[PDB]
Structure formats: C-alpha cells, structure tokens
Amino acid sequence: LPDLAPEPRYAHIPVRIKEQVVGLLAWNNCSCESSGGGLPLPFQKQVRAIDLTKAFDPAELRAASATREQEFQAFLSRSQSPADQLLIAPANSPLQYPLQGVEVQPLRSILVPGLSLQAASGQEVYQVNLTASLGTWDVAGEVTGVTLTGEGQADLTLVSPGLDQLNRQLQLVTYSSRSYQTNTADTVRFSTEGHEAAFTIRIRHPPNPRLYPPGQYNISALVTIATKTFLRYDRLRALITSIRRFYPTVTVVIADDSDKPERVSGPYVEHYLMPFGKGWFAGRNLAVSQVTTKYVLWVDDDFVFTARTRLERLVDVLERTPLDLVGGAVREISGFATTYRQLLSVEPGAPGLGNCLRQRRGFHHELVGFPGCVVTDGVVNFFLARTDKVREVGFDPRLSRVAHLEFFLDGLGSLRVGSCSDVVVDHASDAGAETYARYRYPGSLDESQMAKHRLLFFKHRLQCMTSQ
Amino acid sequence: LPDLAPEPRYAHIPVRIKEQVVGLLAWNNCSCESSGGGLPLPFQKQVRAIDLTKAFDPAELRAASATREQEFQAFLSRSQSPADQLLIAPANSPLQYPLQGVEVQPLRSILVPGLSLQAASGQEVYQVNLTASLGTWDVAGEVTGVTLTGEGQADLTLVSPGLDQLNRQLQLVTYSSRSYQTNTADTVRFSTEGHEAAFTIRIRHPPNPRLYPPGQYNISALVTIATKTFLRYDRLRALITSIRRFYPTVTVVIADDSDKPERVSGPYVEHYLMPFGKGWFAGRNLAVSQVTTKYVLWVDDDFVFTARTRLERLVDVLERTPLDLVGGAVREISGFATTYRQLLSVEPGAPGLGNCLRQRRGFHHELVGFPGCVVTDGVVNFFLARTDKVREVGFDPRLSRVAHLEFFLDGLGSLRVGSCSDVVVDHASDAGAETYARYRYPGSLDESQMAKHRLLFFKHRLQCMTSQ
Ligand SMILES: CC(=O)N[C@H]1[C@@H](OP(=O)(O)OP(=O)(O)OC[C@H]2O[C@@H](n3ccc(=O)[nH]c3=O)[C@H](O)[C@@H]2O)O[C@H](CO)[C@H](O)[C@@H]1O
Numbered sequence: 001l002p003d004l005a006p007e008p009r010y011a012h013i014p015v016r017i018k019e020q021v022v023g024l025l026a027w028n029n030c031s032c033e034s035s036g037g038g039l040p041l042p043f044q045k046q047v048r049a050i051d052l053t054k055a056f057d058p059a060e061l062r063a064a065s066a067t068r069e070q071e072f073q074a075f076l077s078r079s080q081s082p083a084d085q086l087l088i089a090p091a092n093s094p095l096q097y098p099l100q101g102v103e104v105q106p107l108r109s110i111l112v113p114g115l116s117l118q119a120a121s122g123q124e125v126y127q128v129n130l131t132a133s134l135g136t137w138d139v140a141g142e143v144t145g146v147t148l149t150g151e152g153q154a155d156l157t158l159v160s161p162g163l164d165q166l167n168r169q170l171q172l173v174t175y176s177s178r179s180y181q182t183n184t185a186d187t188v189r190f191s192t193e194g195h196e197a198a199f200t201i202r203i204r205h206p207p208n209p210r211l212y213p214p215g216q217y218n219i220s221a222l223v224t225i226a227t228k229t230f231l232r233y234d235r236l237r238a239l240i241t242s243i244r245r246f247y248p249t250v251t252v253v254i255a256d257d258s259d260k261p262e263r264v265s266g267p268y269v270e271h272y273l274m275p276f277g278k279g280w281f282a283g284r285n286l287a288v289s290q291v292t293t294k295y296v297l298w299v300d301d302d303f304v305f306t307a308r309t310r311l312e313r314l315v316d317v318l319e320r321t322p323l324d325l326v327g328g329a330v331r332e333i334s335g336f337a338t339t340y341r342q343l344l345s346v347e348p349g350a351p352g353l354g355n356c357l358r359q360r361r362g363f364h365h366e367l368v369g370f371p372g373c374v375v376t377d378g379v380v381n382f383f384l385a386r387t388d389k390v391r392e393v394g395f396d397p398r399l400s401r402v403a404h405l406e407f408f409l410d411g412l413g414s415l416r417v418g419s420c421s422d423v424v425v426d427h428a429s430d431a432g433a434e435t436y437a438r439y440r441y442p443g444s445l446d447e448s449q450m451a452k453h454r455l456l457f458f459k460h461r462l463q464c465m466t467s468q
Numbered sequence: 469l470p471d472l473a474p475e476p477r478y479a480h481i482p483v484r485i486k487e488q489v490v491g492l493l494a495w496n497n498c499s500c501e502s503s504g505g506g507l508p509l510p511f512q513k514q515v516r517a518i519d520l521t522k523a524f525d526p527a528e529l530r531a532a533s534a535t536r537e538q539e540f541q542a543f544l545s546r547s548q549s550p551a552d553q554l555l556i557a558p559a560n561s562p563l564q565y566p567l568q569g570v571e572v573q574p575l576r577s578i579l580v581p582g583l584s585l586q587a588a589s590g591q592e593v594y595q596v597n598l599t600a601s602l603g604t605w606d607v608a609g610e611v612t613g614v615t616l617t618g619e620g621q622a623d624l625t626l627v628s629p630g631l632d633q634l635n636r637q638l639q640l641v642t643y644s645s646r647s648y649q650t651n652t653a654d655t656v657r658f659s660t661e662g663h664e665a666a667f668t669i670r671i672r673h674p675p676n677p678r679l680y681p682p683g684q685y686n687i688s689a690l691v692t693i694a695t696k697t698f699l700r701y702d703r704l705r706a707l708i709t710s711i712r713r714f715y716p717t718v719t720v721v722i723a724d725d726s727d728k729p730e731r732v733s734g735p736y737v738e739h740y741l742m743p744f745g746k747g748w749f750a751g752r753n754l755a756v757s758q759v760t761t762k763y764v765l766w767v768d769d770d771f772v773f774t775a776r777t778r779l780e781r782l783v784d785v786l787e788r789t790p791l792d793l794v795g796g797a798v799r800e801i802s803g804f805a806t807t808y809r810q811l812l813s814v815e816p817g818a819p820g821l822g823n824c825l826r827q828r829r830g831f832h833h834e835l836v837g838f839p840g841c842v843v844t845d846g847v848v849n850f851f852l853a854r855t856d857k858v859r860e861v862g863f864d865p866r867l868s869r870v871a872h873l874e875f876f877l878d879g880l881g882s883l884r885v886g887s888c889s890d891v892v893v894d895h896a897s898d899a900g901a902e903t904y905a906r907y908r909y910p911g912s913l914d915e916s917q918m919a920k921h922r923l924l925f926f927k928h929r930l931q932c933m934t935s936q
C-alpha cells in the first residue's frame with residue numbers, strides 16, 4: 001500500500017533506496033514457511049507452518065473468505081471514527097487551534113481551548129468561521145465590538161474590526177454535542193480568508209472506572225482462584241488441599257463438565273456444573289464470570305501449591321505495575337519449571353487472503369524493578385490477572401477441547417502480560433482415565449483440530465501461522 | 469473548572485456573560501435534589517434523590533472516600549495516554565505535519581505522512597529536527613544533497629541547501645517503535661529555527677475483529693437465548709415450551725442457583741448449576757459466558773413467547789445498524805406493554821465527593837428506517853445483543869439479588885442501545901413461594917440495598933443519584 005512513488009513535483013530529484021529501511025515497512029505480502037525437514041541442527045529452531053486454508057474444501061474456503069471479508073467490512077464501519085482520519089496541519093496559517101485532546105460527553109458542552117487568529121494588526125475587519133457536523137457553537141460571553149452570526153447553529157461566524165476583541169471572543173467559544181452517539185468524533189473546520197484548519201473534537205463518555213474496594217495484602221479480598229475440571233477428581237482434591245495448606249479462606253471457583261459429577265464442597269469452594277463435555281474454554285469463561293474480586297488466579301486442576309506459590313508476589317506485581325496479567329512458573333515432577341513465555345505477532349498479508357500469525361518462544365524486555373520478571377505476549381496457564389481484563393478478552397467457549405495461546409491471541413494488544421519465574425506451582429505427574437485421554441488427546445486431523453483452524457482463520461482473519 | 473476570567477493581556481476588553489450558555493458548562497458541583505413533596509402535578513415527574521454517602525458510617529465514609537480516590541488515581545495512570553494531552557497547533561509556523569491519524573504497531577515501522585517545511589524559495593541552508601521518546605527515525609531513501617544526523621536514533625536532523633530536496637527527504641522519513649507497549653502514544657517534536665510543533669503517533673495493535681462464521685436469517689446459528697432461574701421451574705418450563713412453539717432448534721442456556729435443582733433438559737437446552745443463592749447478575753454473567761453465537765437474547769424465566777416475539781426483527785436491527793443491544797417490549801397480563809426506555813447520565817461533582825447519576829424515563833431519538841424503534845441508554849430485560857459487547861460490559865456478579873439498570877450503567881458509553889416496541893414477549897402473571905419472595909423482595913433498608921449503594925458509590929465514583 002506504500003508506493004514511495006516520486007510525484008511529478010519532485011520527479012527530478014535523485015533518491016537512493018535504503019534496502020534495510022524499506023524492509024522494515026509492511027508490504028502486505030506475508031507467507032508462512034517451515035524450516036526444512038530432516039534432523040535438526042544445534043543452533044536452529046524448527047519452524048513449522050500451518051496453512052489454515054487447508055482446513056476447508058475449495059468451496060468452503062471461497063464462501064468463508066467472502067463472508068469473512070463481509071463481516072470485517074461490517075466491523076470496520078462500526079469501529080472507525082473521524083478521529084482516525086489522516087489530517088495534515090497547514091503551514092503558514094494564522095489559525096491557532098487545538099490539535100488533539102479536546103473531548104465532550106454526548107449531549108454536553110465545553111469551552112473549546114486555544115482558538116485564536118494570529119493575523120497581523122491593521123486590517124479593516126477580521127472574520128473567522130467555525131463549522132461542525134454533530135454539534136453547535138455558542139459563546140460564554142458576548143465581547144463588545146464582535147458580531148456573531150449563527151449562535152446555536154452548526155456554522156458560526158465571528159466578525160470584528162478589532163483583532164484583540166476577536167481573539168477574546170474565541171476564548172469564550174463553546175461547542176455543544178447535539179445528537180447522541182456513544183463514541184464518535186466531530187471534525188470541525190476553523191477558517192479565515194484563504195486559510196482553513198481541520199481538527200477533531202472527540203464525543204464520548206468517560207470510561208467505567210471499575211474501582212474495587214481494597215478491604216500487607218488480604219489475599220481473600222483481592223484474589224479468587226479459578227479452575228476447570230473434567231473427570232479428574234483426585235487431582236482436583238489434591239489441588240484444593242494444597243491451596244488450603246497456604247490460603248485457607250481464598251475462594252476457589254470450579255467449573256465442571258464431567259458426565260457424572262462428584263460432590264466437591266468445603267469452605268470457600270464454589271462448584272459450577274455444566275452440560276457434559278461443553279468444554280475447556282467454556283468452563284474457563286464460566287469460572288471467570290463468577291469472580292467478584294479485583295484479581296483472578298488461573299490454576300489447572302492438576303496443580304499443587306507449595307511454599308513456592310507465594311501469591312503475594314504476583315499481587316505485588318499487579319498492584320505496582322500497569323500489567324493486567326502476570327504468569328508464574330509451573331514445575332514438572334522431573335524438576336523442570338516453565339514460565340512458557342511466548343511472543344505472538346500478526347503480520348499483514350495479501351488483500352483478501354488474510355494475515356500471518358507468528359508464534360515464537362521468548363519475551364520483549366525485563367520488568368524494571370522486579371528481578372526474574374519479564375514482559376511478553378503469553379504465559380503458562382498459571383497466572384494472576386485483573387478479573388475485568390480477563391473477562392474483556394474472554395475464553396472463547398467454542399474452544400472446547402485443546403487450547404492455550406488462543407486466549408493470549410484474543411487478548412493481543414488488549415492485555416498487558418508479564419511473567420515471573422520465582423512464583424512456582426507444581427504440576428502433578430479406570431474408566432475415567434481412558435475417557436479423559438480420549439477428549440484431551442484427539443487425532444491431529446480430528447474434527448477438533450480442523451474446526452479450530454477454520455475458527456482461527458475466520459475469527460482473526462488469518463491465512464496461515466508459524467509455530468517456533 | 470473552565471477558566472472564564474480574562475487574562476491580563478485582554479483584561480481591558482468588556483464581556484457580557486451569557487447566563488444561558490455558562491449554565492451548559494460543567495462546574496463540577498453537581499448535587500441530587502428530590503422534587504417537592506406532596507401530591508404530584510399533571511406535567512411534572514417526581515424526582516427522588518438517593519445519597520450514597522449515607523450508605524456508610526461517617527467514620528467509614530472518610531476511609532472509603534480516601535481509598536476510592538487512591539484507586540481512581542491508579543486507574544487514571546493505567547488508562548491515560550500522551551494522545552489525551554491538550555496540544556495546540558501554533559500559528560504562523562512553516563511546519564506542515566500530521567495532526568492525527570498516524571499509527572504504528574508496537575515494534576513496527578511506518579513512513580510518516582505529511583511532513584514538510586514550507587519556507588522561502590532560495591535560502592542558505594534549511595534544517596529540520598524530529599524528536600521521539602518511544603521510537604527512532606530513519607529514511608526509506610537518501611535524497612542527494614540532504615545531510616542526515618541521527619538515523620536510527622530518537623533525535624534526527626535533516627539539513628539541505630535545497631528546500632525541494634529537504635521536502636522530498638521528509639516524504640521518506642520513517643518512524644519505528646523501539647520498545648514494546650500494548651497501547652500508548654509517542655508525542656514527537658518537529659522543529660526548525662524559531663518554530664516548534666508537537667504531534668502524536670499512536671502505538672497500538674489493531675483491534676481483535678471477533679468475526680463470526682455463517683455455518684433469511686438462521687436464528688439457530690445467530691442467536692442463543694439466555695436466562696436465569698431460581699425456584700420457579702413452572703415458569704421456566706412454560707417459557708421453554710413457548711419458545712419451542714416458534715423456535716424449535718434455538719439453544720436455550722439456563723443458569724440456575726436453586727438449592728435443590730430440578731432437572732431441566734430437552735433438545736437444544738443447556739442447564740448450568742450454580743452454588744445455592746450465588747445470585748442474579750452472577751447467573752446472567754454465567755449464562756452469557758457460555759454463548760457461542762453472534763447474538764444473545766436475554767429473557768427472564770417468567771416470560772412467554774407469542775407470535776409477537778418475532779426475533780427476526782431484532783436480528784434485523786442488529787444486522788442493519790451499529791446498535792449493540794436492542795430491547796423489545798414486555799407485556800403484562802393486564803395488557804400494558806413496557807419497553808422501559810431509560811436515559812442515564814453522569815454529571816461531574818466536587819473533586820473527592822464523586823459524581824451524580826441521573827436516571828430518567830425516555831429516549832434520545834428515533835432509529836431512522838425502523839418505525840417504533842428508538843435509541844436510548846437502557847431497556848427492559850428483554851433484548852437481543854451482540855454477545856461480545858454484553859460480555860465486555862458484564863453483569864457484575866456482586867449484584868446478587870435485585871438489579872437492572874446497573875448493567876446499562878456499567879455499559880454506559882460502551883454499549884449502543886436501541887428499543888423496538890413491535891417485538892413483544894408476555895410476562896406471566898407454597899414453601900417455595902415464601903422463600904422466592906424472601907430473596908426477590910428484601911427491605912429497602914436491608915443489607916442488600918445498603919451494600920448496593922456502597923458498591924455503586926465505590927465502583928462508579930458516585931456520591932448520589934436521582935431517579936425520575
Ligand atoms: C499449565 C498449562 O499451561 N497447561 C495447559 C496444557 O496442559 P496439559 O497439556 O498438561 O493438559 P491437562 O491434561 O493438564 O489439561 C488442562 C486442563 O484441560 C481441561 N480439560 C481437558 C479436556 C476436556 O475435554 N475438557 C477440559 O476441561 C482439564 O480439566 C484441565 O484443567 O494444555 C491444555 C490444553 O487443553 C491447557 O491449555 C492447559 O492450561
């Protein structure tokens with residue numbers, strides 16, 4: 001979409017391309033390619049590409065691409081605002097005006113700051129026009145010697161023989177929003193003879209501040225532990241026992257889609273029963289919907305708390321930083337502990353094909369002031385998070401079987417993710433077991449995998465992904 | 469406080485205040501006052517005030533106000549961006565620069581549009597500086613005759629004897645984000661001799677488009693019906709029977725926190741069991757967390773479908789308009805039908821006391837192209853909505869007993885609300901009944917009401933509310 005074309009005005013000018021800088025720009029032509037096959041080499045990491053288009057019959061793919069384009073166009077039309085338009089500030093204009101940072105509530109009024117005409121003195125008359133589209137102009141006070149035409153209308157003229165009078169009058173100009181919209185903007189025109197300025201007034205409500213009473217840290221007040229279980233009651237009970245060993249009154253919310261659910265009860269345990277096999281992320285979404293505390297801790301039902309599960313440290317990070325989610329480390333019985341720090345980026349692909357997802361191990365930078373903590377895009381499913389941010393992102397209930405990074409991908413950009421290596425939880429090593437493994441370990445060409453590829457293709461407008 | 473008072477530069481100028489316009493401005497001094505007592509008058513609506521500060525012991529009120537202020541300051545610090553700063557465009561600068569609309573992904577690069585120096589034809593040397601704080605400048609190509617100092621640094625100088633060369637060079641300037649943040653902005657400085665311009669590059673990811681597959685309108689694919697029941701299985705079953713009379717394969721999600729839950733099942737019914745008395749909005753939040761369709765229809769368990777519950781019309785409105793939620797009408801057995809169209813606004817109050825909520829019956833305007841439909845802030849609990857918007861706003865699981873407008877208040881500004889009068893659902897007219905009434909109908913000085921006032925005081929930074 002960049003042409004870097006020499007316009008005819010400057011086509012006489014020589015330019016030598018910077019090969020290195022032009023490579024940094026988005027060329028909307030991404031693809032996903034695997035590492036070669038064969039035995040791996042010590043300092044090479046094997047990259048695997050998935051073509052998501054292969055999850056569809058050619059007829060399915062064409063229909064899906066069309067519908068996905070239609071739905072995306074619909075989305076853009078509901079999202080995009082005059083505030084997103086490219087405006088260029090004119091040079092050598094006598095018009096002084098607010099460039100950004102001017103906002104009014106729907107159906108409310110403000111004084112518009114910083115309006116003035118820096119014309120030269122000595123003209124016979126000075127005139128300025130204000131034009132709006134979603135509001136109307138008026139003045140907080142009439143300046144003696146200034147003539148106003150259009151008070152309470154979308155177009156306002158100010159005319160004055162005195163320049164100082166005109167400028168004083170502009171300090172008193174008000175904008176009022178006149179029709180109700182939830183979150184939009186009005187691109188105003190401010191003008192004088194032979195000069196024109198566009199600027200934008202944002203028309204929106206202030207955000208819901210969602211403040212939590214705080215009640216060092218009362219963990220029971222700040223934190224709810226959320227989990228999802230299925231046919232693994234032994235693991236679940238060991239988890240609850242281990243939690244209570246360190247945190248006796250912290251509420252544990254358990255979503256459960258077992259066919260024949262056992263009773264789980266005890267002080268500060270909330271058990272939710274779901275239709276059999278409704279699924280994984282559905283149950284995670286259920287569990288988080290019931291959290292009343294500022295923070296939620298995700299734990300799997302196969303976890304065990306130890307003296308290393310110091311939740312206070314995770315709380316500390318979220319209390320002291322702008323992070324929304326902070327992951328801990330999960331230690332296998334083999335002694336290895338993983339923070340599963342992942343980077344996720346989407347790269348622009350060809351128009352209509354969709355974009356490319358890159359997943360790779362790693363993090364962005366260290367978290368200043370917090371040794372052993374980093375900022376990254378995704379973590380292991382042991383994490384403390386602001387409940388509201390987790391619910392704003394959501395665990396898509398369609399992800400019924402096997403999913404992990406799909407949450408961090410849904411939250412990408414929306415969610416400020418960190419990862420601390422020093423808060424550590426252990427991971428634990430009949431009819432029920434064969435059944436559990438049948439749901440948890442399907443074929444890789446199973447309808448589950450295909451469905452998830454089609455879903456990720458559609459939902460996030462991807463064509464392909466690379467895993468590394 | 470908008471500053472009205474004349475600066476010493478213009479203190480010599482007379483201004484006559486417009487009493488009418490000054491009254492439109494926010495003076496950060498809102499209060500809540502009841503209508504006069506006594507018998508009401510034909511064209512007057514009785515306004516009643518609730519003082520939320522009276523929900524606290526006066527000792528506790530001071531602690532609450534302090535900690536509420538602290539939490540809000542924390543909130544602001546995590547929300548606010550350099551993009552929200554008031555920038556004033558200087559008059560009479562040769563600097564042309566992008567005013568808004570310039571955006572880059574974290575750790576990505578763009579050509580900066582619209583940079584130029586509009587100067588004299590032929591001068592000695594022309595020099596322009598660019599300064600950034602979260603990124604680095606570089607050029608997509610070196611223009612012959614232009615000298616660059618600081619390529620790949622935060623500060624970049626361009627210098628040229630030729631003005632055309634300099635301007636061509638500016639068409640090739642790139643900004644690269646250099647540190648990772650999810651959603652911020654860099655306020656850059658563009659400068660030349662004796663001239664300075666500030667402008668902001670927004671650094672953020674594109675939004676999650678959350679597109680829904682297609683798998684007239686297939687109601688079963690687009691819509692899930694969501695409800696919450698408690699000890700009223702007769703009503704619930706009559707609802708399900710009535711739904712099936714018109715919509716045989718539409719999924720019904722039922723959240724249930726009854727003590728001894730009855731079995732509810734049938735084709736396309738999903739029953740979720742909650743701990744006894746976990747509550748109302750908790751169960752609404754639960755029900756919505758399980759919806760996999762583009763839209764969710766909220767119905768109470770006491771509803772009955774008729775030929776007038778033509779869901780297709782509600783779907784039509786959300787398919788064809790930027791609305792997020794569209795309410796229908798609920799008809800009492802007495803024959804009266806309510807759309808319960810409400811307006812909600814928050815008005816700024818004194819710093820530290822909090823703001824004032826105004827609730828009044830009414831709507832903003834008619835929904836053009838849809839007779840009998842209006843745009844408003846809240847509706848009766850019969851509505852079709854985009855599932856994702858409903859979950860983004862959420863039903864606060866703290867509201868365990870009696871709540872309605874609290875949802876629309878949480879969604880205020882976030883949620884585009886409409887109301888159609890022609891889609892109509894009926895509202896249906898023992899040990900269990902005494903118990904049901906005990907939970908549904910507490911005293912108005914009961915701990916439930918007091919708790920809700922303290923919650924709304926804290927959560928939304930309100931001091932008081934008026935209901936009309
Ligand atoms: C510590 C960590 O980062 N673990 C992740 C990983 O665990 P693992 O690969 O170790 O798998 P696991 O067997 O521990 O399963 C994790 C969770 O899946 C649940 N389950 C499984 C099958 C089913 O039909 N329904 C259901 O709810 C189960 O009850 C449990 O809480 O991979 C899973 C993929 O599914 C999840 O992303 C886990 O969070």
Ligand SMILES: CC(=O)N[C@H]1[C@@H](OP(=O)(O)OP(=O)(O)OC[C@H]2O[C@@H](n3ccc(=O)[nH]c3=O)[C@H](O)[C@@H]2O)O[C@H](CO)[C@H](O)[C@@H]1O
Binds near residue numbers: 697747748751850908
């Ligand atoms: C059509 C409409 O706008 N109705 C609203 C109104 O209904 P009503 O005044 O008709 O009251 P209702 O008794 O039907 O209550 C509505 C809902 O409350 C639920 N319930 C009640 C008590 C309890 O402890 N737990 C629980 O879940 C119950 O399952 C039912 O679906 O006022 C309610 C009480 O706040 C809700 O705002 C309703 O949506």
Ligand SMILES: *[C@@H]1O[C@H](CO)[C@@H](O[C@@H]2O[C@H](CO)[C@@H](O)[C@H](O)[C@H]2NC(C)=O)[C@H](O)[C@H]1NC(C)=O
Binds near residue numbers: 215219220221249
């Ligand atoms: C930590 O938080 C818990 C949960 O909010 C507090 O427990 C509640 O405290 C209130 C106020 O004293 C009591 O009315 C409730 O009965 C308690 N709820 C339950 C179910 O335990 C607890 O008091 C807090 N602890 C400290 C040290 O402040």
Ligand SMILES: *[C@@H]1O[C@H](CO)[C@@H](O[C@@H]2O[C@H](CO)[C@@H](O)[C@H](O)[C@H]2NC(C)=O)[C@H](O)[C@H]1NC(C)=O
Binds near residue numbers: 686689
């Ligand atoms: C929309 O699409 C189709 C056709 O309208 C329907 O889905 C199928 O309906 C048959 C009829 O009972 C079932 O046997 C299939 O298993 C359905 N497939 C599904 C559930 O996708 C249905 O009317 C709508 N689809 C959905 C998603 O409910």
Ligand SMILES: *[C@@H]1O[C@H](CO)[C@@H](O)[C@H](O)[C@H]1NC(C)=O
Binds near residue numbers: 027028029030031
């Ligand atoms: C993308 O397309 C442009 C068009 O010429 C090309 O210059 C660029 O190198 C391409 N990149 C890839 C990844 O093929």
Ligand SMILES: *[C@@H]1O[C@H](CO)[C@@H](O)[C@H](O)[C@H]1NC(C)=O
Binds near residue numbers: 127191193
């Ligand atoms: C401003 O408005 C006046 C009054 O309509 C109009 O005649 C004029 O062309 C406009 N021009 C300026 C000064 O922007």
Ligand SMILES: *[C@@H]1O[C@H](CO)[C@@H](O)[C@H](O)[C@H]1NC(C)=O
Binds near residue numbers: 495497498499
């Ligand atoms: C708010 O302040 C304005 C201006 O200072 C004053 O005229 C007005 O009456 C005040 N209103 C209330 C309710 O205090």
Ligand SMILES: *[C@@H]1O[C@H](CO)[C@@H](O)[C@H](O)[C@H]1NC(C)=O
Binds near residue numbers: 597623660662
């Ligand atoms: C431009 O940058 C140089 C960097 O050394 C500095 O000397 C100068 O103050 C800047 N120019 C202006 C006028 O801001």
Ligand SMILES: [Mn+2]
Binds near residue numbers: 300302427
């Ligand atoms: Mn496991």
Ligand SMILES: [Mn+2]
Binds near residue numbers: 768770895
């Ligand atoms: Mn009712």
